[PDB]
């Protein structure tokens, strides 16, 4: 099938987020055990290495509607973090492919906000705990 490569986060991190999603009062909140940054989305399957140890990979984001194919304004908070890009590249380096026209690492804190709007740009010190790496449908 395909791959799917994605980040999780710490304990204070995971803190951060939902603390993020209760003050904005965000509408269909993503759950805790559900946060997570995409890393690799590919219709093919490569033999991506996860990886191992933890530390911090971005300090902060803003938010942005990213729409889903099903129509849903998904809330996200977007980063620009080397280290995602990077492992972003590796998988593309080992063959990986992403039918999208740029990779824009991401933390959905909303699946669908409706018809409202959601604006700012947040510090969050977002720790990677583990990549974990399986098959797509």
């Given at each position: 099938?395909?791959l799917?490569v994605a980040?999780k986060?710490?304990?204070?991190?995971?803190?951060?987020?939902?603390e993020?999603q209760?003050?904005?009062?965000?509408?269909?909140?993503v759950?805790?055990d559900?946060?997570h940054?995409?890393?690799?989305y590919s219709?093919?399957?490569?033999?991506?290495?996860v990886?191992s140890?933890?530390?911090?990979?971005?300090?902060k984001?803003?938010?942005?509607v990213?729409?889903t194919?099903?129509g849903?304004?998904?809330?996200?908070?977007?980063?620009?973090?080397?280290?995602?890009?990077?492992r972003?590249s590796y998988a593309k380096?080992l063959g990986?492919?992403?039918?999208?026209?740029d990779?824009?690492?991401?933390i959905t804190?909303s699946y669908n906000?409706?018809?409202?709007?959601?604006?700012?740009?947040?510090k969050?010190?977002?720790?990677l705990?583990?990549?974990?790496s399986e098959?797509?449908?």
């Amino acid at each position: 099938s395909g791959l799917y490569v994605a980040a999780k986060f710490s304990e204070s991190t995971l803190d951060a987020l939902e603390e993020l999603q209760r003050s904005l009062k965000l509408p269909n909140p993503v759950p805790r055990d559900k946060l997570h940054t995409t890393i690799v989305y590919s219709r093919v399957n490569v033999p991506y290495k996860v990886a191992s140890g933890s530390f911090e990979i971005a300090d902060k984001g803003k938010l942005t509607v990213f729409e889903t194919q099903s129509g849903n304004r998904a809330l996200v908070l977007e980063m620009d973090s080397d280290y995602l890009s990077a492992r972003h590249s590796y998988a593309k380096a080992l063959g990986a492919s992403y039918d999208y026209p740029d990779y824009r690492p991401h933390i959905t804190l909303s699946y669908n906000i409706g018809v409202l709007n959601f604006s700012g740009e947040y510090k969050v010190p977002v720790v990677l705990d583990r990549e974990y790496s399986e098959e797509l449908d």
